[PDB]
Amino acid sequence: ARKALIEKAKRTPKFKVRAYTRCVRCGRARSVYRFFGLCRICLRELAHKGQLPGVRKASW
């Protein structure tokens, strides 16, 4: 996550298509779950801390 690239958030991307999501926490580009706004790593870390309500370990 390069700091200049956090220019990602833009009210004026100049095009809707140039708009891409990032991780709100670590700034990761790839693997960003839309539901949590996080990336997958952060997702697992916070899920493990219990800071994501309702999120539990799944087994079946």
Partner RNA sequence: CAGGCCUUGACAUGCUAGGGAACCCGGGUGAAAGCCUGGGGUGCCCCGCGAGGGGAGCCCUAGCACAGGUGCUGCAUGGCCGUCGUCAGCUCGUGCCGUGAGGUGUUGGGUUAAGUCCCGCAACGAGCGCAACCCCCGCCGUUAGUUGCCAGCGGUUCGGCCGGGCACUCUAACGGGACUGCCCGCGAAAGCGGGAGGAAGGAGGGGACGACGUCUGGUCAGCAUGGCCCUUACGGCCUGGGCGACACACGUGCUACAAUGCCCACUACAAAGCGAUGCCACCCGGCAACGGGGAGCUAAUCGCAAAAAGGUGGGCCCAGUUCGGAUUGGGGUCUGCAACCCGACCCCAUGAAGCCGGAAUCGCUAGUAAUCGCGGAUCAGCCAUGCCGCGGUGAAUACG
Binding-site ranges for RNA (CB under 7 A) = 1-5, 7, 14-18, 20-21, 23, 25-28, 32-35, 39, 41-42, 45, 57, 59-60
Residue 32 three-state SS = strand
Q: Does 39 belong to an annotated binding site?
A: yes
49 touches, from another protein, RNA, Mg ion, none (C-beta below 5 to 8 Å by class): another protein
Structure-token pair, residue 51: 């800071």
Beta bridge partners of 32: 39
Residues 6+ apart with CB under 8 A from 47: 55
Residues making contact with another protein (CB under 8 A)? 24-25, 31, 33-38, 40-41, 43-44, 47-58
